[PDB]
mmCIF file of C-alpha atoms and ligand atoms in Angstrom:
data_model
loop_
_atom_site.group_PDB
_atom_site.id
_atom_site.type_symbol
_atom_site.label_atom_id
_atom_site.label_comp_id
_atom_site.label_asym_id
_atom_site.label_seq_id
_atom_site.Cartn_x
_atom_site.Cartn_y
_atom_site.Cartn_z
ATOM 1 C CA UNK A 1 1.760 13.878 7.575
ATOM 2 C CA UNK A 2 3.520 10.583 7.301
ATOM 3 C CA UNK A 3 4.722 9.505 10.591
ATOM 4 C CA UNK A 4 8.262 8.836 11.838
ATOM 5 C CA UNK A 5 7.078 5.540 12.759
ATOM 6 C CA UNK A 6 6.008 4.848 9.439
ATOM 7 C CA UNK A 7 9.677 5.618 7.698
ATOM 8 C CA UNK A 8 11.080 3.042 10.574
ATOM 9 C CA UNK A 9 8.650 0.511 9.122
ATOM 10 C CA UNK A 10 10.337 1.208 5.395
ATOM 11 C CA UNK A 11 13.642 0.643 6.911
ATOM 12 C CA UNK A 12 12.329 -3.239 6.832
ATOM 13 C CA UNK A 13 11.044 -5.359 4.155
ATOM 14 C CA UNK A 14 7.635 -6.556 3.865
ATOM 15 C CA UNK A 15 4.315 -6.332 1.529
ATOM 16 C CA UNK A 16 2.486 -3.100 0.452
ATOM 17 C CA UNK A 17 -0.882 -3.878 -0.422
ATOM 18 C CA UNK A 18 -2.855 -1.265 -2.389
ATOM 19 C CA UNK A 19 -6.525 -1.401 -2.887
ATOM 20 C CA UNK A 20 -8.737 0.534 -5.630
ATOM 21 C CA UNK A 21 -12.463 0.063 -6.322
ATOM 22 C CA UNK A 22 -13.226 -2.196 -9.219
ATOM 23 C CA UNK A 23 -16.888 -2.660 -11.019
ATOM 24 C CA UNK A 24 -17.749 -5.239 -9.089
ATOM 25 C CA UNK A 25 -15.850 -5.069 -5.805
ATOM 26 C CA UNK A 26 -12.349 -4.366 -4.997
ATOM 27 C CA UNK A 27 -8.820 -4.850 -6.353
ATOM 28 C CA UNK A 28 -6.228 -5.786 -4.164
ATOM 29 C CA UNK A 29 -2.057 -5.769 -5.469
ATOM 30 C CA UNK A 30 0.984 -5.334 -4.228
ATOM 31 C CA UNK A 31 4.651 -4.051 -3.974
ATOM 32 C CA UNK A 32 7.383 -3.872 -1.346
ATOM 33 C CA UNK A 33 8.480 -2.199 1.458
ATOM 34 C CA UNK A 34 11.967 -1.604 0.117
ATOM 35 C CA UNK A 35 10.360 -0.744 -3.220
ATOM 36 C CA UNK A 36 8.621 3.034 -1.624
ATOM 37 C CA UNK A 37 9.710 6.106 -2.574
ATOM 38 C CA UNK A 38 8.701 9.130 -0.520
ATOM 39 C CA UNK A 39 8.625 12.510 -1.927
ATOM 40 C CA UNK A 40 7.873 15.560 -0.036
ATOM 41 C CA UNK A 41 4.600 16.855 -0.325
ATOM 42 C CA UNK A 42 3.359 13.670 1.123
ATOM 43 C CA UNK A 43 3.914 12.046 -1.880
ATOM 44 C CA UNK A 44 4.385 7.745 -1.967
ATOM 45 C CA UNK A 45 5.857 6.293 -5.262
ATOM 46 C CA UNK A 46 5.397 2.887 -6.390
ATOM 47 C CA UNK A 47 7.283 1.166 -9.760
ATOM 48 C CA UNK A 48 4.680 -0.184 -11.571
ATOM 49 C CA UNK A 49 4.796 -3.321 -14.047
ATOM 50 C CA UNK A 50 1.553 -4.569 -14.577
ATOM 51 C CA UNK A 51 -1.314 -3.168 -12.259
ATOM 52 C CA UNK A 52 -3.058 -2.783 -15.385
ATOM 53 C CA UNK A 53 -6.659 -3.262 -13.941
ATOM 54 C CA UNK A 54 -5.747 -0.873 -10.490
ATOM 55 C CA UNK A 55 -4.375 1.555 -13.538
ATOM 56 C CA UNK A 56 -8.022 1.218 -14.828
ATOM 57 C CA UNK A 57 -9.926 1.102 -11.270
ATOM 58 C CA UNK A 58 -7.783 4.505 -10.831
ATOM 59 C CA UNK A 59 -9.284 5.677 -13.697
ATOM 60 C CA UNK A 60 -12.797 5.658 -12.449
ATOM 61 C CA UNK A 61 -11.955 6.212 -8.978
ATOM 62 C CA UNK A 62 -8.314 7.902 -8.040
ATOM 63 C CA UNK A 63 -9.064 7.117 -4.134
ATOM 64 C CA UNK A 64 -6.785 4.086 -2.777
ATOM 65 C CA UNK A 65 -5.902 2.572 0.374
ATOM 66 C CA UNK A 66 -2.760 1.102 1.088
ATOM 67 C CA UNK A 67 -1.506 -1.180 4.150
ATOM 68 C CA UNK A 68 2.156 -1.980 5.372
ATOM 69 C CA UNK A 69 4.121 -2.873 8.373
ATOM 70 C CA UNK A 70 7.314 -4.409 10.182
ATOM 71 C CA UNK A 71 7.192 -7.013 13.151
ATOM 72 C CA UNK A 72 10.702 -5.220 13.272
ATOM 73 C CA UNK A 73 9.175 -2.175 14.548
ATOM 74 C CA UNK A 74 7.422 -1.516 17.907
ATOM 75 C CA UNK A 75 3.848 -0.848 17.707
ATOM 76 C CA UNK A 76 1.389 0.500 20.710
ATOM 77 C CA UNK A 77 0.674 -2.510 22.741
ATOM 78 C CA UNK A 78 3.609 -5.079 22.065
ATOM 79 C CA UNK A 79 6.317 -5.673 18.768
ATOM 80 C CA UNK A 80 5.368 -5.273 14.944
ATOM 81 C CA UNK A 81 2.921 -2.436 13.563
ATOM 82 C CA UNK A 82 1.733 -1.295 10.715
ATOM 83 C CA UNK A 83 -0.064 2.006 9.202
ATOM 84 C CA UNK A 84 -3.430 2.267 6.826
ATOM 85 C CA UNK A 85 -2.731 5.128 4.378
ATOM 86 C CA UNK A 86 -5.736 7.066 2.533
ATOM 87 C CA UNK A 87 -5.287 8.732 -0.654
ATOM 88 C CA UNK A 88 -5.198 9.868 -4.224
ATOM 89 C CA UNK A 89 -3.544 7.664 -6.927
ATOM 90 C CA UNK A 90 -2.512 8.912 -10.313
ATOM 91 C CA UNK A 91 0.184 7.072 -12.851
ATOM 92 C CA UNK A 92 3.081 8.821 -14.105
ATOM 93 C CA UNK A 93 4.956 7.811 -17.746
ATOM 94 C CA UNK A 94 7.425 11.040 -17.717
ATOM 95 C CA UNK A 95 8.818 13.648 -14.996
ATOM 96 C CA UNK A 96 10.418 13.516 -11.737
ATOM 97 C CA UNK A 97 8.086 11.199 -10.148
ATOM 98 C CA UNK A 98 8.571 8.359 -12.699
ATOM 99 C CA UNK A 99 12.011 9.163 -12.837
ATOM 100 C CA UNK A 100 12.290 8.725 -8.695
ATOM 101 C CA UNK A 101 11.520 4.782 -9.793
ATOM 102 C CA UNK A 102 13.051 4.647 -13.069
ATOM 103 C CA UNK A 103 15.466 2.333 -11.678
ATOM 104 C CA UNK A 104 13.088 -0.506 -11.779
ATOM 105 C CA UNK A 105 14.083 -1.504 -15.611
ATOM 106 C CA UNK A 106 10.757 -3.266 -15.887
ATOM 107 C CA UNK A 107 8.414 -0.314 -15.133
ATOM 108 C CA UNK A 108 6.407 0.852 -17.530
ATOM 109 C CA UNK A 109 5.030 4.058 -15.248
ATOM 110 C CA UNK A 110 4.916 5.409 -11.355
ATOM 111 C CA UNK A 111 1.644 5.125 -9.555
ATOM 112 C CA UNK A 112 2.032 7.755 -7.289
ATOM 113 C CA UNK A 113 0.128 8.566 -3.929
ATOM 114 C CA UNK A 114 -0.799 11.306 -2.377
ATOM 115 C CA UNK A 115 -1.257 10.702 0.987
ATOM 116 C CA UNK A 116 -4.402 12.544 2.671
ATOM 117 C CA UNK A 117 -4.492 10.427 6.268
ATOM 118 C CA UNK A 118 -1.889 7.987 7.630
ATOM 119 C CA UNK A 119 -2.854 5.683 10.564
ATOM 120 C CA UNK A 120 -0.728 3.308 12.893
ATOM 121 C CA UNK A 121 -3.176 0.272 13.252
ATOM 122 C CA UNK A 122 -1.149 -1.097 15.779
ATOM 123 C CA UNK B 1 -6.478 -25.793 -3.485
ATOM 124 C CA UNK B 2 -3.344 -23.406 -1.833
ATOM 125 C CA UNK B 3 0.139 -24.611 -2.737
ATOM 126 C CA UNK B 4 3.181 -25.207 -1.134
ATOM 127 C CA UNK B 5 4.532 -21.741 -1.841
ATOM 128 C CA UNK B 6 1.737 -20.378 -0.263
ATOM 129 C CA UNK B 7 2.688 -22.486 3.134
ATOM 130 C CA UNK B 8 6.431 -21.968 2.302
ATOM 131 C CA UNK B 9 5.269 -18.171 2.690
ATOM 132 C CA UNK B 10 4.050 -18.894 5.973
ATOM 133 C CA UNK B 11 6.686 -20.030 7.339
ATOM 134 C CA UNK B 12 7.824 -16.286 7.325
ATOM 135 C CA UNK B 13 6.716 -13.402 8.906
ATOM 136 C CA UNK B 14 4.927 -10.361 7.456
ATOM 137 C CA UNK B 15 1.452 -8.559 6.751
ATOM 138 C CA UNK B 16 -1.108 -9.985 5.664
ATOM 139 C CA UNK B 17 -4.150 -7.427 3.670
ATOM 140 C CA UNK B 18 -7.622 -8.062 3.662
ATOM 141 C CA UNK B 19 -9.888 -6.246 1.430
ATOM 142 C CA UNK B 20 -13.542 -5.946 1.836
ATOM 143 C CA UNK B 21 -16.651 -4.090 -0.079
ATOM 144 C CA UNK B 22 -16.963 -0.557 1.932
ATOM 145 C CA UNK B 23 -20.398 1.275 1.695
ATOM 146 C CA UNK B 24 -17.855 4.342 -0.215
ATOM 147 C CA UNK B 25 -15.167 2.059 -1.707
ATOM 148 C CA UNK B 26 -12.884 -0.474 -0.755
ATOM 149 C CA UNK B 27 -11.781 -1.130 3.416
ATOM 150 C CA UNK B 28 -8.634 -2.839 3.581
ATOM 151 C CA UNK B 29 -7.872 -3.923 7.000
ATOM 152 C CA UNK B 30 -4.281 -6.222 8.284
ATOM 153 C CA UNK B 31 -2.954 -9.274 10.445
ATOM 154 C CA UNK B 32 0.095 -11.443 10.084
ATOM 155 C CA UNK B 33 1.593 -14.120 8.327
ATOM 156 C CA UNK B 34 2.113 -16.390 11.659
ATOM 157 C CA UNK B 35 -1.156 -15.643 12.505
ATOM 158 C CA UNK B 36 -3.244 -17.441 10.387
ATOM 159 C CA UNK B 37 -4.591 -20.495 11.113
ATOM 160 C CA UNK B 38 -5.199 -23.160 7.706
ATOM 161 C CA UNK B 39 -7.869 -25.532 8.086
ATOM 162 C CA UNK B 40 -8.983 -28.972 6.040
ATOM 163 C CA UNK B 41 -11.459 -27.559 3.179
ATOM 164 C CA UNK B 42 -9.548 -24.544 2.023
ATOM 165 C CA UNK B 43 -10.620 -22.447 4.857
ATOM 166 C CA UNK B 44 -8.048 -19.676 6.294
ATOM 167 C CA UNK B 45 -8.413 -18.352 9.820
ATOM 168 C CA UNK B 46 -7.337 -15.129 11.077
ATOM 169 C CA UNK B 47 -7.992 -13.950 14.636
ATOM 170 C CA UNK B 48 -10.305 -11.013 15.087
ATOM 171 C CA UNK B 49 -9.730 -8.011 17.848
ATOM 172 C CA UNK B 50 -11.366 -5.359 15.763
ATOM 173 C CA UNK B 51 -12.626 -5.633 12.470
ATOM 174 C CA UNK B 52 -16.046 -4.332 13.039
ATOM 175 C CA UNK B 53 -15.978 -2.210 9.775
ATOM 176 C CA UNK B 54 -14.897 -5.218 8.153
ATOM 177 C CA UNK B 55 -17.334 -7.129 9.424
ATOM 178 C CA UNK B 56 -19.920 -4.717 8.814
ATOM 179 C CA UNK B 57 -18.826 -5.210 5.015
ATOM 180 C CA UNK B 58 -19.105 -8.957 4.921
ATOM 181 C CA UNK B 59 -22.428 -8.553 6.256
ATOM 182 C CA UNK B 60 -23.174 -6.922 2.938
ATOM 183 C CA UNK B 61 -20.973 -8.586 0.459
ATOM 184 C CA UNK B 62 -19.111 -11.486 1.790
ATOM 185 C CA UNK B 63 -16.619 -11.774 -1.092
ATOM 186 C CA UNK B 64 -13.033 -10.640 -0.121
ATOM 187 C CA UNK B 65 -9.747 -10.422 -1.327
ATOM 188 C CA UNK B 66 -6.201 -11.659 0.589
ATOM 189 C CA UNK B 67 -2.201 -11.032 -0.080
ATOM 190 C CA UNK B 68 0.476 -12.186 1.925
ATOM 191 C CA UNK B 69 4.248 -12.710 0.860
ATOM 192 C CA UNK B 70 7.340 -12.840 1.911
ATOM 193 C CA UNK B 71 11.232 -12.001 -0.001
ATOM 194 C CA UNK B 72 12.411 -15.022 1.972
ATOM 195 C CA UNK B 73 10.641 -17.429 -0.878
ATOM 196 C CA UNK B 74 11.272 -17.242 -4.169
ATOM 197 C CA UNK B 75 8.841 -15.961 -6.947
ATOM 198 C CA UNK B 76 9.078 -17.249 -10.985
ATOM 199 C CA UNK B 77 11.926 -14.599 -11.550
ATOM 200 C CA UNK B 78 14.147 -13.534 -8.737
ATOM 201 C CA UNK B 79 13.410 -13.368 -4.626
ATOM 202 C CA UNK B 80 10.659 -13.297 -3.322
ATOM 203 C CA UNK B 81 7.027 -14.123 -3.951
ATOM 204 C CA UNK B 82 2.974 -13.549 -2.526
ATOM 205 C CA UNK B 83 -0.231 -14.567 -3.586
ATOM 206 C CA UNK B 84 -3.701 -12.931 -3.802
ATOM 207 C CA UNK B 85 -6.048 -14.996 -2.384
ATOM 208 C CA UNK B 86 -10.253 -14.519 -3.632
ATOM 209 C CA UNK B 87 -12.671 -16.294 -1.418
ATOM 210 C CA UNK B 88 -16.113 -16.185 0.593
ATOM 211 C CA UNK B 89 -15.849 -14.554 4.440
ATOM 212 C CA UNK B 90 -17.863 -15.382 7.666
ATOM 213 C CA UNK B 91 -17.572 -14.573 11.539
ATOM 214 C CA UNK B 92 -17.530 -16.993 13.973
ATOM 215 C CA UNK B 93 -17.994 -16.625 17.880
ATOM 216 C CA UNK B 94 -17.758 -20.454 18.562
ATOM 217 C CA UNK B 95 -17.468 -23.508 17.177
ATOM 218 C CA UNK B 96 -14.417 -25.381 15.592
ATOM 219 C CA UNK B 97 -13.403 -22.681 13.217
ATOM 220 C CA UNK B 98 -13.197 -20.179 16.399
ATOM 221 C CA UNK B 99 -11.509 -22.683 18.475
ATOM 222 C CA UNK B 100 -8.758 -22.869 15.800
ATOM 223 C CA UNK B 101 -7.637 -18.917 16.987
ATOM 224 C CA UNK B 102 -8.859 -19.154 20.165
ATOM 225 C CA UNK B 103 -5.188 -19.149 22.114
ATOM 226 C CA UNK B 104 -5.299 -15.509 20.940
ATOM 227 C CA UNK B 105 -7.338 -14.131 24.325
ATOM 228 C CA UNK B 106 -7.946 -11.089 22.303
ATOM 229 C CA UNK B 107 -10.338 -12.211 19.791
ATOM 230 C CA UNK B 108 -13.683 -11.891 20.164
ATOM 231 C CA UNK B 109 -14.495 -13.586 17.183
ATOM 232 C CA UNK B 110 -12.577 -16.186 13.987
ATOM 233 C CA UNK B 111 -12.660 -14.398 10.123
ATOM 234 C CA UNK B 112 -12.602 -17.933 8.350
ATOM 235 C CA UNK B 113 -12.418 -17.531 4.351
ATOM 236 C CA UNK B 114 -13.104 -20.128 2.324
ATOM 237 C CA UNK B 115 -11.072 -20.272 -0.527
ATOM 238 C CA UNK B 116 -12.288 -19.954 -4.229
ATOM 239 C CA UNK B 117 -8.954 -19.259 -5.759
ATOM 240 C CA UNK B 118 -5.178 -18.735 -5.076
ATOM 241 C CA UNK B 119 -2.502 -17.183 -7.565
ATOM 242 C CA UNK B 120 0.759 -16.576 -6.838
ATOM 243 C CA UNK B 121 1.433 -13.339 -8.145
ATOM 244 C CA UNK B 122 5.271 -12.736 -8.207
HETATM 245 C C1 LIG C 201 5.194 -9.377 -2.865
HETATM 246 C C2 LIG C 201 4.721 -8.819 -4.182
HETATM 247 C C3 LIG C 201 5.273 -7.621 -4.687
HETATM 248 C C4 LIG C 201 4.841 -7.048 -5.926
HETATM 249 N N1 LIG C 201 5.408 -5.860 -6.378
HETATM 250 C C5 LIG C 201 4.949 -5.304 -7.528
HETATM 251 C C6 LIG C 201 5.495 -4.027 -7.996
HETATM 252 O O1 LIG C 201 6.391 -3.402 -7.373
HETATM 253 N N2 LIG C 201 4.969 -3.532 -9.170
HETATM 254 C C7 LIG C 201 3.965 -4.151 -9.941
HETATM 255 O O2 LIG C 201 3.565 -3.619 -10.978
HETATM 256 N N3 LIG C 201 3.455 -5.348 -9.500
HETATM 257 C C8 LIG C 201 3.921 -5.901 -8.349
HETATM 258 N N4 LIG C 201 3.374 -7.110 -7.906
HETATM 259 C C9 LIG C 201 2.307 -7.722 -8.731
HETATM 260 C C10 LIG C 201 0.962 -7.028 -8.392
HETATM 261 O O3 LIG C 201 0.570 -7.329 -7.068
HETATM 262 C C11 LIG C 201 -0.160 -7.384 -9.363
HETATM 263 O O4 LIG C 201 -0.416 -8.806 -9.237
HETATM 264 C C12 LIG C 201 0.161 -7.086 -10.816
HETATM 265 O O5 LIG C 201 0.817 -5.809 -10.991
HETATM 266 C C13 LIG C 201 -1.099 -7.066 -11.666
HETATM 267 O O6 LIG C 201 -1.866 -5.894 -11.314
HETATM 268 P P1 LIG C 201 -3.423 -5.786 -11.719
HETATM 269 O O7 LIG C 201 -4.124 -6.958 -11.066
HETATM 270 O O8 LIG C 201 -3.839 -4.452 -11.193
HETATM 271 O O9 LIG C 201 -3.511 -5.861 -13.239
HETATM 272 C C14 LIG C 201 3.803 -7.728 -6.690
HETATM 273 C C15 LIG C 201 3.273 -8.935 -6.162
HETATM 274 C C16 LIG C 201 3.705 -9.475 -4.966
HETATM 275 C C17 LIG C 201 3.076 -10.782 -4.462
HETATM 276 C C1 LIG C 202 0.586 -5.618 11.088
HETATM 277 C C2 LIG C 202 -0.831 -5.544 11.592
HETATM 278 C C3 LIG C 202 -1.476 -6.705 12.052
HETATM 279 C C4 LIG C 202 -2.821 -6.688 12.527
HETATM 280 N N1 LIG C 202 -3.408 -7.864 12.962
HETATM 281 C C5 LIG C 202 -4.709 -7.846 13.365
HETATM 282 C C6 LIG C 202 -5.362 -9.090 13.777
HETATM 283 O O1 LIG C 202 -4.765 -10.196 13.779
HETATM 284 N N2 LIG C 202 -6.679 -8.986 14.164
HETATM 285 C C7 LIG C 202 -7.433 -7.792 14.194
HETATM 286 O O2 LIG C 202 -8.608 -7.814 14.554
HETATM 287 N N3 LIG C 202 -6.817 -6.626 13.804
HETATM 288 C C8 LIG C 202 -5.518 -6.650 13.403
HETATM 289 N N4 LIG C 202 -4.909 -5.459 12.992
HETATM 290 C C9 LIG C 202 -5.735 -4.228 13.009
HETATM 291 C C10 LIG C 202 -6.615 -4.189 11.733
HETATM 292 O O3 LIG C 202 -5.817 -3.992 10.575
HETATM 293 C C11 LIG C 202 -7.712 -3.125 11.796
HETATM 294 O O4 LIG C 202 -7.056 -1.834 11.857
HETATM 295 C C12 LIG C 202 -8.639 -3.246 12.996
HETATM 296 O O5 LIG C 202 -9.029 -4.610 13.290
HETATM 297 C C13 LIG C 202 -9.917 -2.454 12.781
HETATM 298 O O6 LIG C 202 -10.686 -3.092 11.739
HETATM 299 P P1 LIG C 202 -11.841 -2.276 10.978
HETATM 300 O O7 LIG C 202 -11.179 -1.071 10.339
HETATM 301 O O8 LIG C 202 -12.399 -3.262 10.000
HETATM 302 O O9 LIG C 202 -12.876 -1.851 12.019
HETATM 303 C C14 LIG C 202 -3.556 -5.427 12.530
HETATM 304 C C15 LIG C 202 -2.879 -4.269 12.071
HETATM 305 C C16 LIG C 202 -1.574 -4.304 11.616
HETATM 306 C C17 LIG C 202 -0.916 -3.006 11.125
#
């Protein structure tokens, strides 16, 4: 369901920003633009290093939001958009979808989304 | 309280996340780098169009949660850096704080977050 307009926006660099539901309010981290992986199956892979607490908030609650976008990329009413992505999170340690960031020699697992809406904010 | 970096960053385009406390988990809603407007007392401006379900969640909790970056700074180990910025949130329709955004015609109202805390997380 991901958009062409959103795979123009990965073509650029800029900040992901994932959000998960904490115990007392949410979590908010990041990753990069340049750092997404897209599987089919609607599938978005991010190289994880620490996100130790979203890890944990994914635990209790597997549904995240995620944000991104590209001044670099028209949007609806004038230059630069950006999407607002819905869905479920779940971390990898073994298989294809760590091994689709394995590159990253730092990561210690794949937190990998599956996307159930994607939006163009802009 | 926010360091240089943090203005360094700012000097560079890119999107801004804002996460709030959502009646059924997190809302996470966007702006831009260039768009944000610092004032004296560790208050950060951003120019509202929509955010009405983001308001709507600052009504309720008024805690909220900020990252911005950009790979054109550099973090503690290679390119590139952000921050994730914790802080109190409140909408203004006049006043200084709204005059501070007010070039942008579109907003019908100033987000100004005070700042509790800043860490640069990369
Ligand atoms: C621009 C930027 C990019 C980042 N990219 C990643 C990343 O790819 N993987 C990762 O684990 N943390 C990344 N981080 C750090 C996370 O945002 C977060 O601070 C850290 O993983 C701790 O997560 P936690 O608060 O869930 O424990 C990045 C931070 C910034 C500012
Ligand atoms: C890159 C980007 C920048 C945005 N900048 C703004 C902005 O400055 N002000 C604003 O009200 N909405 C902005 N939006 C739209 C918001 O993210 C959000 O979708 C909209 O305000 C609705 O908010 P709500 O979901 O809280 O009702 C931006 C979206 C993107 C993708």
């Amino acid at each position: 369901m991901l958009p062409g307009t959103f795979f123009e926006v990965l073509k650029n660099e800029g900040v992901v920003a994932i959000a998960t539901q904490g115990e007392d309010g949410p979590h908010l981290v990041n990753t990069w633009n340049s750092y997404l992986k897209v599987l089919d199956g609607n599938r978005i892979v991010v190289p994880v290093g620490g996100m130790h607490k979203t890890e944990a908030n994914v635990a209790r609650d597997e549904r995240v939001l995620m944000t991104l976008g590209s001044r670099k990329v028209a949007g609806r009413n004038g230059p630069g958009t950006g999407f607002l992505i819905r869905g479920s999170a779940a971390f990898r340690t073994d298989g294809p979808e760590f091994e689709a960031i394995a590159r990253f020699k730092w990561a210690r697992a794949a937190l990998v989304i599956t996307v159930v809406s994607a939006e163009q904010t802009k």
